[PDB]
Backbone:
């Protein structure tokens, strides 16, 4: 067992998480009426750690379609309307022990 | 200073984050051509810790519009087509020292 763990709905962090969640639900709803918690049937919490990778990368369009092999070292386009380049900023959230990675943020401006 | 910290683009976690990010960029692009890193201009990493709150909550629609006061203790609707209830599951990602909260996951089924 390495999963979540029960917590009383009294504990303040729960209390704040709940109000937050409910706030967000109402904010996103199309209902003109306000909804609120009727009953918190179960509350669990879990401390997690991960690593954010913040990459500032320059990307170039290669000459290879995504349907061919050897894309890793494939030649960049150099022709007039085919060549494109972009400066990008990536944020990857990694949780090592789980082997997972998540693209948290991603923007690119064609330079 | 409590922000990110430089890392060589050699370090494997960076290397994996980069391939991941680039993979995700290509996957989401409308381009038939494959793009790849031209140059990693900057690489930084940062270890973060937070708490996931996992709430299983039953919500009820109140009689108050979102434009009035005292929504916290506002009466639930009980009339035929106005009363609604929903069982929901919320995941809130909190980063204590920063006072931030994020709604990571959210589903509700009108029961
Ligand atoms: Cl851990
Ligand atoms: Cl920390």
Residues:
């Amino acid at each position: 067992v390495g999963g979540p763990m029960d917590a009383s709905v009294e504990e303040e962090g729960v209390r704040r998480a709940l109000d937050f969640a409910v706030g967000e639900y109402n904010k996103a709803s199309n209902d003109m009426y306000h909804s609120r918690a009727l009953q918190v049937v179960r509350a669990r919490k879990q401390i997690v750690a991960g690593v954010n990778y913040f990459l500032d990368v320059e990307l170039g369009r290669t000459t290879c379609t995504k349907t061919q092999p050897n894309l890793d070292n494939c030649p960049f386009h150099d022709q007039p309307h085919l060549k494109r380049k972009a400066f990008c900023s990536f944020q990857i959230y990694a949780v090592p022990w789980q082997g997972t990675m998540t693209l948290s943020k991603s923007t690119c401006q064609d330079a």
